[PDB]
Amino acid sequence: GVGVSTGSYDNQTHYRFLGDGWVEITALATRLVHLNMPKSENYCRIRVHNTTDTSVKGNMAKDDAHEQIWTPWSLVDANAWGVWLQPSDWQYICNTMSQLNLVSLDQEIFNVVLKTVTEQDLGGQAIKIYNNDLTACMMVAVDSNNILPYTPAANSMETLGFYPWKPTIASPYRYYFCVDRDLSVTYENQEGTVEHNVMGTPKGMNSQFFTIENTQQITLLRTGDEFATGTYYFDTNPVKLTHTWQTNRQLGQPPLLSTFPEADTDAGTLTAQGSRHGTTQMGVNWVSEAIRTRPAQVGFCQPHNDFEASRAGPFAAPKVPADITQGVDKEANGSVRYSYGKQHGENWASHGPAPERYTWDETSFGSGRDTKDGFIQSAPLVVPPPLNGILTNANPIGTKNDIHFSNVFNSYGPLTAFSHPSPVYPQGQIWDKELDLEHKPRLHITAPFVCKNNAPGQMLVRLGPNLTDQYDPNGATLSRIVTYGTFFWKGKLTMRAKLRANTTWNPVYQVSAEDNGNSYMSVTKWLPTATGNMQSVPLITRPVARNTY
Amino acid sequence: TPKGMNSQFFTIENTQQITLLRTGDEFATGTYYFDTNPVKLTHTWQTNRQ
Incomplete structure (x- = not known):
């Protein structure tokens, strides 16, 4: 069965129009994946403490200590828009549809290739010779019951490459382990010392060690084999591709x-x-x-840069995105900062490790908040208020200046209503698993589509251990033959969207390319260079506006 | 003191069906079915940082 392809390559996108403007979109994607031997044939419990940073007074925020389990397995994650579409399409869709939803997902792996390396002499120097190992196999599995910890690769820009004509790699599977951690509060040059900065040990009540081998059904596949998952149907809610503008002062x-x-x-x-x-x-x-008097409250004041803390250190309570208003209170309305690699958008011409960064500003205009202009008046209401009868963003809370009511105020309530954060094109995550908690959160900010039911299983892969003539179970030295492989992955993402209606008299905002220049939309950004360098920056996801009430 | 708008005085005698029972008698309720949600008997550990 060797010497024959086992699949087809396809990275097209098809649109099917049904009546009533519904539209079925079928996204097809194929990529060539490169897989390397696992660093170690073992599962490792690893601790990570950055004392070198945490020990400095007032550096809590730079903390990133934890303990994780490292598996010899790697995973194929395609959970990211950039994988499925072609810039232009995203343009089309956004400029034309009014809403979009997830439907089905199909995947298959094929045309597996396994190879080993050996060295030889070519003029005194040692060069590498590449040979095909036929009998060698690759390993696949899918945690469709979601036994294993869910770990979105988009979390770390480790999904698959957004460029079809270029190969990719898999992200290695690692998951958080349980150990308590404590860290004290200090500031710029507070006298004294950093009291506590400790890392605990394994607790009997929370220790969870999982193995691929003990939980999944592993399929072996030599070069002639092929593998496919059944079809998965999403049970998710649609996302509007229109943005809002009316604020609490334009209702009624x-x-x-x-x-x-x-x-x-x-x-x-x-x-x-x-x-x-x-x-x-x-x-x-x-x-x-x-x-x-107005119907309800559009948007709300969120306490900013609220670090909270619990048994494993401190962390920034997440913020619901929103427009930044005129006061450009970016951080105050939770805009998002993306730091990505070349394979995920960054220009290939850039140098060194330097990541490329972008900050997403939500377009939900009716719900932004201007900190500087916010204020509270006192009990009975007074025409113009006395200095004592009004708290502003100048007066200090506690006893520090720079720290006003805004920072600890939270106007969230029964009348609070709002927009759902939009998807972000090249690098945005697409779907996500819900938290197994009796009382769920009204949404996730890391993604648009939350699976109401069980979510798609994670796909794990691993090269089969390729031994030598010398083997001993008790030897610390695991001598094995150098090996690596490649294989194609193909997915079929199916969405359903509806065409927008035209109701205004005046023309309307549309995403558009623009002549070579400065404007964010210089068509050149989406073109190759004379050497072929590509770049893919994000696009506006909700160009058109909709009445809110 | 007692407010006209919120005074609520209830009596057993005026609202329930009372059953009398001497030593030889016996009494039983029908069967009641709960419409409730399940409770997990497992605890959690992952914090916002895991």
Whole structure:
């Protein structure tokens, strides 16, 4: 059965139109994967303590100590938009559809190749000779019951390459292990010492060591073999591809004008606040837009840069993304900073290790928050407030300046309503497994699609141990033949989307390429260089706007 | 003191069906079926940092 292909290459994208503007999109993707021998044939429990950083006063935030289990297995993760689409398509979809959902997922591995290396003399120097091992095999498995810890490769930019004509590698499988960790609070030059900075030991009640070999059904496959998963159907909710704008101050019937502008430069006027009709929740005897009653609360104030902590150290409580407003309160509204590699977007022309970075600013305009302009007034309400009857973003909380109410205020409540963070093209994660907790979270921020049911099983691979003539179970030296392989992976992602409707009179915002220049959309960014260097930056995901109420 | 809008005085005699039973009598309720959610008997450990 050797000497015959076992699959087809395909990286196309098909659109099928049903009636009523529904559209079935079929994304096809193939990649050539390169697999190397595992560093060690063993499972390793590894501790990681960066004392060299944590021991410096006021450096809690740079902490990244934990203990992990390292498996000799690697995994094929395609959970990332960049894998399935072609920039242009994403453009098309976003410029044309109003919503999109996940449907089915299909995968198969084939045209397996295994090789061994040996060295020989060529003018005194040692060169490598490459030979085909036929009998050697590769190993595959799929945790469809999700026994193993879920570990999105998109988490670490280790998915597959977003470029079809170029090979890729797999991310090695590693998962968190349980040990307690404590670290104390200190600041820029606080006198004293860093009291605690310890790393615990294995606890009897929380130790979880899993092995691939003991939980999955492993399929062996030599070069002539091939493998495929059945079809997986997602049970997920759709995502809107339209953005919002109305803010708590554009909900309802704008006030009744009493005077109309007579020239394109004038403004209009309303009836006097003192004799205007309406409703508020203030005892005053007037009414103005800002004090007026509205249906619910669009967006909300989030406590910023809140590090919390629990039995394994401290961490930044995640923020629900939102627009940054005029105050460019990026960090305040949880925009996201992406740091990625060449194989995932970074220009190939760039140098050294230096990662390329981008910061995503949500487009949900009706829900952003401007910190500087936020404030609280005191009990009964007073026309203009006395210095003592109003707290602002200047007054210090606790006893430090720089630290105002905003930082510890949380206006989340029953009336809080909002937009769902949008998908981010090249590097964004696509779906995610839910947390096994009786009381779930209204969403995840790392991804758009959360599986309501069991999620797609993770695909694990590993090269079969290739021994030598000399073997001994008790020997610390595991001498094995140098080996490595390649194989194609092919996936079929199926989505369903609906065409948008045209209701405005005025034209509308659309994503578009643009002549060679500065503008973010210089078509050149998406073109090859004279040597072939490619680059793929993110695109706006929600170009068009929709009424909110 | 007692407010007119919130005063609620209930009596067993006026709301339930009382069954009398001497020594030779006996009494039983029908069967009641719960419509409740299950409880996990397993505990968790992963924290926001795992």
